Structure 1
Amino acid sequence: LEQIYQDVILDHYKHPQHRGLREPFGAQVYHVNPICGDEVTLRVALSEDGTRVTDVSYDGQGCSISQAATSVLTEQVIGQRVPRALNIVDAFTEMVSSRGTVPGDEDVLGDGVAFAGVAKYPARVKCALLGWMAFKDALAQASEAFE
């Protein structure tokens, strides 16, 4: 299982989904971690009626875990209705910041469950969160067009 999770992370690190900034988009955010210095620029696009995430595009520098996590994020939320995307994000963030007491559900997170073991390394939690909290922020800002 430990070895399987490693393979998931390597798969997403080497074969990132949805990498590189694209247009169109509703909101861009730039998040820089104040501790490790790594950064993500992330864009969200919504459908015409604002109900679905139609694109998530991103660039930046980080460790393999943060790059893998942002890859997994895009695969889980693109095409999803906004409330569902938010639910996935809350599930992921609950899991990685639970200090190992919340295992995560693969039916919700998919490959996202591969980051369960990060929860037991406090200084690496930020790596899993960088892209996901950038998404939460960008999704909120893009959604303002539809309030």
Structure 2
Amino acid sequence: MSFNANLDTLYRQVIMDHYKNPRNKGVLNDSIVVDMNNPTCGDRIRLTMKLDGDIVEDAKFEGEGCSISMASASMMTQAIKGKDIETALSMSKIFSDMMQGKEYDDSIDLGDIEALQGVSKFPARIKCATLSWKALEKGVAKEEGGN
């Protein structure tokens, strides 16, 4: 194939490490219920979280669609499930800081960024990059505190 291929393995290990985990069928309403679908494909994911303050204490995710979308979300949610609000706001600031600074997450936990960096930038995956990442952003992220 005349492509970089640099994404396949990334999300392969992503969908594979997550296979060890529960799948892409979980939803709750103890806090916030985030839903995002890409009508262009069939891509849809639901990040339902449980944040009793400024911490994500639980997060259940439902996903169906492209192999990368349902993979990146469920992997990074599994990682996000163990974060705080400030940290995840930083994950969104980091997503913004990456493309300009060349560095990214000082913790190197990039479950979504790794999988979606290749997604975010294809005309065929960009609507899915809004699907997955922006939903993840709409879950506990914002990039900027408000400035």
TM-score (norm 2): 0.68
SS at match of 2:41: coil
Is the contact between residue 45 and residue 61 of structure 2 (CA under 8 Å) also seen in structure 1? yes
Picking from 85, 88, 107, the partner of 2:88 is 85
Picking from 34, 40, 45, the partner of 2:45 is 40
Over the matched positions of the two proteins, sequence identity in percent amounts to 29
Could you tell me which amino acid in structure 2 is paired with residue 67 of structure 1? M
Q: Hey, what does 1:10 align to over in structure 2?
A: 12
**Unaligned runs of at least 5 residues, structure 2:** 142-147
TM-score (norm 1): 0.68
Could you tell me which amino acid in structure 2 is paired with residue 46 of structure 1? L
**Unaligned runs of at least 5 residues, structure 1:** 141-147
Is the contact between residue 65 and residue 128 of structure 1 (CA under 8 Å) also seen in structure 2? no
Deviation by residue 1:49-91 (Cα, 9 ceiling, x = unmatched): x121112211131111101210232133222120111221343
Is the contact between residue 93 and residue 129 of structure 1 (CA under 8 Å) also seen in structure 2? no
More helix by share: 1
Provide the C-alpha distance between the structure 1 equivalents of 2:65 and 2:101, rounded to a whole number of angstroms.
25
Greater CA drift, 36-45 or 84-93: 84-93
Aligned CA RMSD, in angstroms, stands at 3.0
Deviation by residue 1:115-140 (Cα, 9 ceiling, x = unmatched): 32334412212223323322333448
